Design a protein around this nucleic acid. Structure first.
Ligand SMILES: [Mg+2]
Ligand SMILES: [Mg+2]
Ligand SMILES: [Mg+2]
Ligand SMILES: [Sr+2]
Length: 140
RNA sequence: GGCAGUUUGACUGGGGCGGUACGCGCUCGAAAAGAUAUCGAGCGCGCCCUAUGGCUAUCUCAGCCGGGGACCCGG
């Protein structure tokens, strides 16, 4: 039964939402791969009189690049619980977001015959804390 | 304008003044095919755009919720 049910880390997105940068240089060092900039939709009084323009950057880490990061990133954070999404997700922090999910996820990310993951296969807050906690650190 | 010839439109609950229903577009009036009037009700057009056109690739939007009214992740 299990195995095809045990949690997995599908992507860790690290980003800095400045609102202006060379911050890409450091985000790339702490992660290992090339960052990408983020534009800002809608204009605002806080001098964002530009819609399509650099406001921040991010990096999406998957597989080893993600673990090699969390091993040296999680120690930096502290909190837990009441900091976890309903989808068994959690973000702390420069921000660090961890996306967790069960094995049959591709079914909702592929092009052909897509389908939205059943709420029964959907990860849970508790199932999340467990997995993480059960991997080099403590909860709440 | 000393003098000559003329013009100075139409619509309109008479005419004048006001206005334009004088060329166009939409809803309603309009009575479940089409057509349909009033100085009928609501309101527009006389442009603007070299991309705000065209095709292809990739992608999904308003709004709300949860996690770190800018940005990031998920629903
Ligand atoms: Mg005369
Ligand atoms: Mg004569
Ligand atoms: Mg008719
Ligand atoms: Sr006369």
């Amino acid at each position: 039964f299990h195995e095809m049910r045990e949690p997995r880390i599908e992507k860790v997105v690290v980003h800095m939402g400045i609102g202006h940068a060379n911050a890409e240089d450091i985000l790339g060092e702490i992660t290992g791969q090339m960052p990408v900039r983020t534009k800002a939709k809608r204009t605002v009084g806080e001098f964002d009189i530009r819609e399509g323009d650099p406001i921040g950057a991010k990096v999406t880490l998957r597989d080893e690049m993600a673990e090699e990061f969390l091993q040296t990133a999680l120690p930096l954070a502290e909190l837990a619980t009441s900091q976890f999404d309903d989808t068994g997700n959690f973000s702390f922090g420069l921000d660090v977001t961890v996306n967790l999910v069960r094995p049959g996820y591709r079914v909702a990310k592929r092009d052909k015959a897509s389908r939205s993951i059943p709420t029964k296969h959907r990860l849970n807050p508790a199932d999340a804390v467990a997995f993480i906690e059960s991997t080099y650190d403590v909860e709440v």
